[PDB]
Design a protein around this motif. Sequence first.
Motif, PDB file in Angstrom:
ATOM      1  N   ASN A  68       1.296  12.812 -12.503  1.00  0.00           N
ATOM      2  CA  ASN A  68       1.822  12.937 -11.124  1.00  0.00           C
ATOM      3  C   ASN A  68       1.074  11.988 -10.179  1.00  0.00           C
ATOM      4  N   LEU A  69      -0.238  11.850 -10.369  1.00  0.00           N
ATOM      5  CA  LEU A  69      -1.027  10.915  -9.557  1.00  0.00           C
ATOM      6  C   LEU A  69      -0.585   9.454  -9.728  1.00  0.00           C
ATOM      7  N   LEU A  70      -0.368   9.037 -10.974  1.00  0.00           N
ATOM      8  CA  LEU A  70       0.014   7.696 -11.291  1.00  0.00           C
ATOM      9  C   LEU A  70       1.448   7.415 -10.875  1.00  0.00           C
ATOM     10  N   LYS A  71       2.341   8.396 -11.029  1.00  0.00           N
ATOM     11  CA  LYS A  71       3.733   8.178 -10.608  1.00  0.00           C
ATOM     12  C   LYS A  71       3.848   8.045  -9.089  1.00  0.00           C
ATOM     13  N   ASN A  72       3.042   8.814  -8.381  1.00  0.00           N
ATOM     14  CA  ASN A  72       3.120   8.885  -6.919  1.00  0.00           C
ATOM     15  C   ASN A  72       2.458   7.654  -6.281  1.00  0.00           C
ATOM     16  N   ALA A  73       1.457   7.075  -6.938  1.00  0.00           N
ATOM     17  CA  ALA A  73       0.694   5.977  -6.327  1.00  0.00           C
ATOM     18  C   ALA A  73       1.491   4.706  -6.103  1.00  0.00           C
ATOM     19  N   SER A  74       1.106   3.904  -5.113  1.00  0.00           N
ATOM     20  CA  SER A  74       1.648   2.531  -5.006  1.00  0.00           C
ATOM     21  C   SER A  74       0.578   1.657  -4.364  1.00  0.00           C
ATOM     22  N   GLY A  75       0.862   0.414  -4.028  1.00  0.00           N
ATOM     23  CA  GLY A  75      -0.201  -0.467  -3.499  1.00  0.00           C
ATOM     24  C   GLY A  75      -1.124  -0.783  -4.660  1.00  0.00           C
ATOM     25  N   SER A  76      -2.416  -0.829  -4.388  1.00  0.00           N
ATOM     26  CA  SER A  76      -3.416  -1.061  -5.449  1.00  0.00           C
ATOM     27  C   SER A  76      -3.859   0.233  -6.115  1.00  0.00           C
ATOM     28  N   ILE A  77      -3.702   0.273  -7.432  1.00  0.00           N
ATOM     29  CA  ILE A  77      -4.023   1.413  -8.261  1.00  0.00           C
ATOM     30  C   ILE A  77      -5.230   1.014  -9.129  1.00  0.00           C
ATOM     31  N   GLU A  78      -6.381   1.595  -8.822  1.00  0.00           N
ATOM     32  CA  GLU A  78      -7.603   1.413  -9.568  1.00  0.00           C
ATOM     33  C   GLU A  78      -7.664   2.375 -10.742  1.00  0.00           C
TER      34      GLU A  78
END
Length: 92
Positions: A68-78
């Motif tokens: 859910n964290l990875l699906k929701n993220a955008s921009g720069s993902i560390e």
Amino acid sequence: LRTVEMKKSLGISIAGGVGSPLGDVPIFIAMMHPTGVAAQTQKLRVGDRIVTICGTSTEGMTHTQAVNLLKNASGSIEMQVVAGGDVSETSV
């Protein structure tokens, strides 16, 4: 330990986590899309275990939480990872 910055799909398939079918195991990269963003970094490998996502520890994360964290993220993902090292599986 490798630190990766990606901009987006990320083109990875993640497995593991607290409460996984094999018990509590670290979140890991089980597959990668050959032409995806992760592949383009040339710094992530199938079998990597994910230590942090978006600057937070994966300690205690379930598979659903990480996804859910990875699906929701955008921009720069560390992401920070460690090599699996053929410790709990063997590459053939």
